[PDB]
Write a protein that binds this ligand. Structure first.
Ligand SMILES: *C[C@@H](C)C(=O)Nc1ccc(-c2c(-c3ccc(Oc4nccc(C)n4)c(F)c3)c3c(N)ncnc3n2C)cc1
Length: 277
């Protein structure tokens, strides 16, 4: 069944006391798995005696043996991936003697799509500015650079799967029923994911950011979306956008993958713009 009754879970140093954990509300519908806001204690290793809000990925009610094996493989992946500023990083675990919980960082601010829609100038309205936007895009690109470094692939790369903590710092999620609009022609037609497809997905994400939570390719049915893309139909420029950034977006949307801007090239360019705030 769910707990290890005939399973081989090793003992790591990552594991967190099954006791101090205490689960809470589940956040959103889990495309990557049922995740729950927990209130862990003494996992920072420097701030005991005070609760810290985290997210834990338990198993679903109709979980199968393969679901648990996939969860443990994903846990090991996270353990190998390493630490980066703008990524949902592993913080703890619950492996031996009980059900499997995977502790990942918690983001106070909701999804990026909802956060930007709620940070729109005259849904609440905390004033938002282009300077903050450019910082967001650069942070996301650096995170994606690191994520590509470990040769990982992003199932659904979109603002609907990017998070923000109380510190207003970007973090990726999903780096380990389909978003057709966020998929490159090569990936939408050959159904093969590649870094160039990740560049296209990142460019679509940038468009979603620049419009503060807009649906890409609005009014375009999915059936003819590929056909329109094949004829060289790329999205228009966002309203409150600059032409240089839009040209970077279109380059990320280049039909040929070879010429598309490398993830490092995008990070360099974004740093260049950020210096001119
Ligand atoms: C599919 C779609 C409708 C959707 O809603 N996706 C979605 C669900 C939940 C959150 C989310 C998270 C969060 C927690 C854990 C993981 O697992 C993960 N993260 C990175 C890499 C890998 C391989 N797995 C998530 F992807 C997302 C979360 C957290 N940790 N804290 C606060 N709020 C949170 N939300 C809303 C995001 C998107």
């Amino acid at each position: 069944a769910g707990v290890s009754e005939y399973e081989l879970p090793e003992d790591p140093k990552w594991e967190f006391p099954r006791d101090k954990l205490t689960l809470g509300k589940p956040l959103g519908e889990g495309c990557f798995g049922q995740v729950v806001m927990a209130e862990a204690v003494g996992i920072d290793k420097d701030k005991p005696k005070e609760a810290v809000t985290v997210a834990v990925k338990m198993l679903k009610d109709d979980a199968t043996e393969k679901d648990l094996s996939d969860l443990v493989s994903e846990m090991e992946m996270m353990k190998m991936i390493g630490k980066h500023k703008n990524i949902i990083n592993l913080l703890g675990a619950c492996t031996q003697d009980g059900p499997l919980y995977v502790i990942v960082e918690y983001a106070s601010k909701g999804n990026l799509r909802e956060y930007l829609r709620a940070r729109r100038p005259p849904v609440p309205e905390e004033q938002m500015t282009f300077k903050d936007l450019v910082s967001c895009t650069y942070q996301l690109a650096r995170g994606m650079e690191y994520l590509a470094s470990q040769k990982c692939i992003h199932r659904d790369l979109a603002a609907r799967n990017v998070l923000v903590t109380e510190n207003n710092v970007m973090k990726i999620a999903d780096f380990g029923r389909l978003p057709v609009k966020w998929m490159a022609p090569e990936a939408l037609f050959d159904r093969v994911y590649t870094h160039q497809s990740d560049v296209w997905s990142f460019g679509v994400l940038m468009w979603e950011i620049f419009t503060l939570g807009g649906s890409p390719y609005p009014g375009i049915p999915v059936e003819e979306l590929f056909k329109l893309l094949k004829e060289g139909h790329r999205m228009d420029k966002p309203a409150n956008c600059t032409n240089e950034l839009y040209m970077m977006m279109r380059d990320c949307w280049h039909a040929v993958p070879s010429q598309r801007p490398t993830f490092k090239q995008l990070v360099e360019d974004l740093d260049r713009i950020l210096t001119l705030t």
